Design a protein around this nucleic acid. Sequence first.
RNA 1: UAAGGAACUCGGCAAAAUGACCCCGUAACUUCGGGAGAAGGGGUGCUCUUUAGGGUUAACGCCCAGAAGAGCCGCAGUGAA
RNA 2: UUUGGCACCUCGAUGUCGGCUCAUCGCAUCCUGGGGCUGUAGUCGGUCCCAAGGGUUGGGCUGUUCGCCCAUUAAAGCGGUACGCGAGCUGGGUUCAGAACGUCGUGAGACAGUUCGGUCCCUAUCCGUCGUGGGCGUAGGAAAUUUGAGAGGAGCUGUCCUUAGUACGAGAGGACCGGGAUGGACAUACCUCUGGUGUACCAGUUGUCGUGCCAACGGCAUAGCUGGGUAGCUAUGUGUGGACGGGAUAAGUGCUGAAAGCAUCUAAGCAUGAAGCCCCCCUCAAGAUGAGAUUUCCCAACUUCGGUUAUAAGAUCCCUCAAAGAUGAUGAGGUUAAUAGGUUCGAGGUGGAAGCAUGGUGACAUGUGGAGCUGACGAAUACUAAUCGAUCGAAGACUUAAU
Lengths: 122, 114, 215, 48, 120
Amino acid sequence: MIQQETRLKVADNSGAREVLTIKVLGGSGRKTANIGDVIVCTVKNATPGGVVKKGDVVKAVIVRTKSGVRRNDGSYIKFDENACVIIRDDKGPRGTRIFGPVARELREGNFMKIVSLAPEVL
Amino acid sequence: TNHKLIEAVTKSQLRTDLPSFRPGDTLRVHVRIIEGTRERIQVFEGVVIKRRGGGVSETFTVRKISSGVGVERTFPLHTPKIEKIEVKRRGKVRRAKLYYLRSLRGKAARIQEI
Amino acid sequence: TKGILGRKIGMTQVFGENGELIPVTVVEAKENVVLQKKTVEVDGYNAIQVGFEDKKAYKKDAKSNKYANKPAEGHAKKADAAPKRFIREFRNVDVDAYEVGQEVSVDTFVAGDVIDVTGVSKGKGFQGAIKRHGQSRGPMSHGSHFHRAPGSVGMASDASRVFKGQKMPGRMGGNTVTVQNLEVVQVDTENKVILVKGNVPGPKKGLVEIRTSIK
Amino acid sequence: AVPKRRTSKTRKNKRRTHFKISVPGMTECPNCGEYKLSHRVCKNCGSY
Amino acid sequence: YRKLGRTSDQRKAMLRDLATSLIISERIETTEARAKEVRSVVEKLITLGKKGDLASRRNAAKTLRNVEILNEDETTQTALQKLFGEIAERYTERQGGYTRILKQGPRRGDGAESVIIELV
RNA sequence: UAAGGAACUCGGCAAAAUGACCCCGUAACUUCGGGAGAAGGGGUGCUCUUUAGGGUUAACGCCCAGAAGAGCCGCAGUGAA
RNA sequence: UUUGGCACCUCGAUGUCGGCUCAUCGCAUCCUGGGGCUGUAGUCGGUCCCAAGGGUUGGGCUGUUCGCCCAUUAAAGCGGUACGCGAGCUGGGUUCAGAACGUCGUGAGACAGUUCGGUCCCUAUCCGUCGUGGGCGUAGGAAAUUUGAGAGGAGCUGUCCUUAGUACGAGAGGACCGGGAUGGACAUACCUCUGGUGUACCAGUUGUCGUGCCAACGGCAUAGCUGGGUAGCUAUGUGUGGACGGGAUAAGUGCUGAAAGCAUCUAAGCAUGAAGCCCCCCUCAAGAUGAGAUUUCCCAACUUCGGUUAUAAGAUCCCUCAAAGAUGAUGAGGUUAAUAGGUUCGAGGUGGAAGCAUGGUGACAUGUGGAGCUGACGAAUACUAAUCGAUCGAAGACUUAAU
């Protein structure tokens, strides 16, 4: 459940560590985003060097929310923090190394590169 | 009779091959994943945080830590997507709901056996 | 077509094909019978009249609706039947397919049939505009003295009045409401119950009218 | 907040048409004494 | 359940006072709602007394007030002792009930439905 | 009060949070007094050992301990204010 | 709808701007819909016509109306309703007492040019509105089921796959027409799942007072605090809905065809044609004084069966209650009885009672034993209470025509 002004850790090696979200895109009046949804965001804390620099406006995909997801079998999955991965406006990442676990609902959105680069997919 | 209808109608959806466990016990859940390709199977090992519900609405949650990140997974007890459950370890806890594990890490989040 | 009556028992869940979870409402559709057959040449419109739950026979010095009265007894005597709690009409059926005294069995419905379900809403009582309608509440700080009231109700001297349909407080609760395009999951003839996918309006042990959808 | 016109006798007594007392039940005490209040063993000789 | 126009602690204390006074006197005059609530309390106390064990004695002492009765023959006992001695023996064979409410007329200072509640 | 965390609003108004005791450490700038309780960290229950301090000291006992070890319990030990 | 001109109502008071809450109307149309022309190849675009059903974002700097910017969106329309709405809310603005800067003034002081600060009253009589009852009526009296004259509600939209990289196009690019799954927002119903709450549920724990002491318990400390949590109530949770289809039409396209031997969409005639109108969908509805219809029940002993004591069908008083509820209504029940309580047993919740024994120096632990306890949930059982009773309640007219 990511709305405007939430802060997310970044789970790639693109260069950013902390990110603030500006907009949940989709339709007009869209308030909250969750796993698989794309957001636009700002980098509030970056790593030295790196591709992306603090103050940049970028697009990200949400992975491993805390208020996680229900599935059609009635199973649920949750995580302990909220995280995102920054993308290249083609569902591809700017980094080359995803960290932490990732949800299985990314396959339904054509994020196969992230799914492949990731460790354990749940 | 007007009070046994739910039980009588949901008796067939209930499973009997599952073992007995309580919170604190360490479980290994084999869940079947019907992907687009095949009917693969994947294992999920962790500590039982929560048991609740009744009959067919019964439900249980397990917790582990994969890559430095905590992960909780909640299943219906009687779902057919669970091939198999194993009770790898037995615990000692004085509490039915282990929500205090969510804010720990390491030796603090260790559970005495038996 | 294909109407029946029942009592709402409760909600559970069931598992379908490929392990999918289905929340389900269980409905007791028991001892339904036909009491009357209205026609265009007599009553002006074709319909059957159905009675659902049997009650006690007439008794002198009876004070409750558990015991039938002489009119109801006579009405349920033409059809060789007992007196019934609830009576409702169905116009969507073919009238020639039914006979007076006939028993409407739950097996008229089978799995996969899309249905409409009608019933009275639960009941809440005198409720305000924030709950009875979806109105926004005012500020709770910054010097506010406007929290849960409704705002203005009209403009000014031009239209020196309030229009009708202004969404003020009042009683919210039991009104009949249909939900369209629910489906039947399965049928159990031994316990005489239907399992409906989803949720239906009303409290437990409350009357519901099930009939077939048009669309 | 205040009335703009006074209320006439007609309007007053129209409003006061539902402002009255009902009549009690008065099941006459079959046992003894004064008449009992219904479902009440009245202190003043009632046997309900 | 009923709140009796009081707070939680006030209600609890008044209920156990009512129950103690009823055990003492075997019939009391009060209001309808208070009687309809204290009924269950005193009945559960009598159930504990019929069970008779130490744990039930303690669970009943949780509720009852510590009061001394002036018994006939210059003897003295507590409400707990009376409950576990006499009131349990009287109802050893009865299964439920133990209390009856009898309506009376309204009071003067109010229009309150007065009631007697009596052990049977 | 889930998730979020000033996005509210003229304005973080109000509320939340901090809060005692012990230890460790603490900047710019200064009229050299200060700032400074800067900031920032850590600890506190019960039981048995003592080697022993304020000593109750006559002495470990009589209370806190010099406070060092070894254990016990719990989600939480200035367990409330 | 502006800035103004006039000075007709209001100075024994007609609340000033913004913002919040709540709306309602118009069309001179922002999106969606349908069309003509194009210096429209396609993709698109521009302009004009029809059209008001629905919809028409969140933030930064602004007192700010206004304006600029950041990110979205199918779109971020223009106006009116005392520049809508302060007896519904703020009070940032301006302007009252204080003070200060600059300028002006001999000065007291002024500007309105700036700046900090600065009390927003009201128990709703009538109309009106939202709900909810009582009385009477409807050619006999009642119980139930209904028709529907009318009225209200609803009406939005996107992305993806295929048709098809096909038509078109030098190529870049790239369709109409149709078929197919999923979403945003909104509305509605519900608590099986996820979670919230859960002050008469379970456990742990501090201080202090008491029960003579131990132990256990109880009181007060926000429910003392903490961790959980059943019923019920709930959204952020679970389901459902709208993009359909018939007719009549607008713009516009037409067929046939004269007036006017031709031509012409029009005069007579025949077609097609839109999110717009009506119907279809949902709900309310015979106080629809036009008061409707069906089924069933009841009917006086006198008696112009008028009036009568009676009384029948049926209601009510009263009482136990909740799927209901401000009251009142509504519904479940009133001993030929499971309405509530109690009792017994369960479900779920908590999480291993007391006592005994054992081990340990002791704090504590282990076993007896998924223990004990348990509000609202479920079943069973008349132990308790719903008593005996009383009241109300009709007597199918007349006229005419058929029979």
